[PDB]
Amino acid sequence: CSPGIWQLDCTHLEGKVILVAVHVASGYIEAEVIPAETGQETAYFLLKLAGRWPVKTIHTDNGSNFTSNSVKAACWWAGIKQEGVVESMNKELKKIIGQVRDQAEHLKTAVQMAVFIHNKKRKGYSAGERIVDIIATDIQ
Amino acid sequence: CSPGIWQLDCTHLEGKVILVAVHVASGYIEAEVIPAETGQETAYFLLKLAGRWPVKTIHTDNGSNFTSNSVKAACWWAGIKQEGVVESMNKELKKIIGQVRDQAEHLKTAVQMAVFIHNKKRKGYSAGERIVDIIATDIQ
Ligand SMILES: Cc1nc2c(ccn2Cc2ccc(F)c(F)c2)c(-c2ccc3c(c2C)CCCO3)c1[C@H](OC(C)(C)C)C(=O)O
Ligand SMILES: Cc1nc2c(ccn2Cc2ccc(F)c(F)c2)c(-c2ccc3c(c2C)CCCO3)c1[C@H](OC(C)(C)C)C(=O)O
Numbered sequence: 001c002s003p004g005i006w007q008l009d010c011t012h013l014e015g016k017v018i019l020v021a022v023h024v025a026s027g028y029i030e031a032e033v034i035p036a037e038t039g040q041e042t043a044y045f046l047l048k049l050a051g052r053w054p055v056k057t058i059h060t061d062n063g064s065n066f067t068s069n070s071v072k073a074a075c076w077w078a079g080i081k082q083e084g085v086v087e088s089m090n091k092e093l094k095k096i097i098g099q100v101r102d103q104a105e106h107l108k109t110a111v112q113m114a115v116f117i118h119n120k121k122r123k124g125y126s127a128g129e130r131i132v133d134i135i136a137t138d139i140q
Numbered sequence: 141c142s143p144g145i146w147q148l149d150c151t152h153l154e155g156k157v158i159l160v161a162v163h164v165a166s167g168y169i170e171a172e173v174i175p176a177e178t179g180q181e182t183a184y185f186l187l188k189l190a191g192r193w194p195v196k197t198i199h200t201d202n203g204s205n206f207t208s209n210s211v212k213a214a215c216w217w218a219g220i221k222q223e224g225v226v227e228s229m230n231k232e233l234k235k236i237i238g239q240v241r242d243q244a245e246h247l248k249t250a251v252q253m254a255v256f257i258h259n260k261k262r263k264g265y266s267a268g269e270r271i272v273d274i275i276a277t278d279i280q
Contacts (some may be wrong), residue, residue, distance in 0.1 A: 030192065044249065051256035052170065052192075054268070078256065109184065116191035116218065128194070129279050136276035139269050
């Protein structure tokens with residue numbers, strides 16, 4: 001679909017929170033392990049994401065995630081609006097984390113290894129290749 | 141120069157550490173405010189960076205930054221090797237942080253606003269546009 005659409009959701013593992021952003025058109029993922037599921041953590045994650053990619057619109061499976069003043073400020077400043085692929089990309093990431101978990105002490109390390117594996121896996125291009133292609137083409 | 145080359149250095153501000161990664165060929169920046177200047181923080185940052193972009197080689201102005209076992213493990217796993225633009229990109233970021241600093245409570249928020257401003261500024265393409273173009277072209 002549209003190249004500026006991202007989906008953001010949190011998932012829970014080992015008593016920690018993983019914020020997962022999916023670029024809907026490519027299946028590319030960005031993720032961070034956050035101390036708590038708060039509006040200030042979501043706002044900070046959104047500022048980082050928007051500085052890296054041309055973020056136009058954000059989707060989520062939990063609308064209340066985006067009600068804080070912190071989040072609304074991040075979206076206002078960065079010029080962001082609110083509105084099977086995402087379910088599939090999140091499923092694949094949770095399974096990859098499980099598969100690499102014993103290779104690291106920290107959950108956050110296993111998460112970043114799973115993001116890397118996911119983005120680099122060709123399906124024939126990878127999600128990492130598709131995002132860069134989708135965004136470059138849209139610039140032209 | 142080569143599209144897989146990144147430069148990583150830390151800078152200090154308000155008693156905190158900012159890890160700054162520059163994509164040498166585009167001038168694109170990624171940055172994080174880290175609790176301390178440690179090998180484990182650098183290793184974690186490198187895993188995140190390598191999952192997002194095709195990182196081949198890393199440069200730094202402080203070689204001792206990359207001696208820890210943590211860093212060597214991150215580079216080994218991600219398949220990374222060691223070897224005016226970077227000085228210019230870091231200079232521009234420090235000045236942008238100064239210019240936006242009073243708009244936020246936290247230094248980390250001002251840092252991410254400065255990264256966003258820097259990557260989106262056209263010079264006529266922006267660093268954010270150039271990185272995506274350089275990487276997409278290299279895939280083809
Ligand atoms: C926490 C951590 N420590 C690491 C390392 C590597 C060496 N050390 C030092 C050390 C010393 C004594 C040990 F008994 C011991 F087990 C590890 C990684 C690490 C770093 C990068 C990395 C991998 C590991 C395990 C796995 C493959 C992907 O890349 C870690 C690591 O944590 C940080 C990334 C935060 C450094 C971890 O969670 O295990
Ligand atoms: C820490 C923080 N709090 C924020 C917000 C916004 C509302 N609030 C709540 C609040 C409540 C009462 C206040 F007196 C008060 F001043 C702010 C931003 C924030 C979030 C996004 C953002 C901006 C700000 C100021 C500036 C432009 C770029 O986008 C913050 C912010 O910190 C996080 C990003 C970690 C949430 C900050 O450092 O100020």
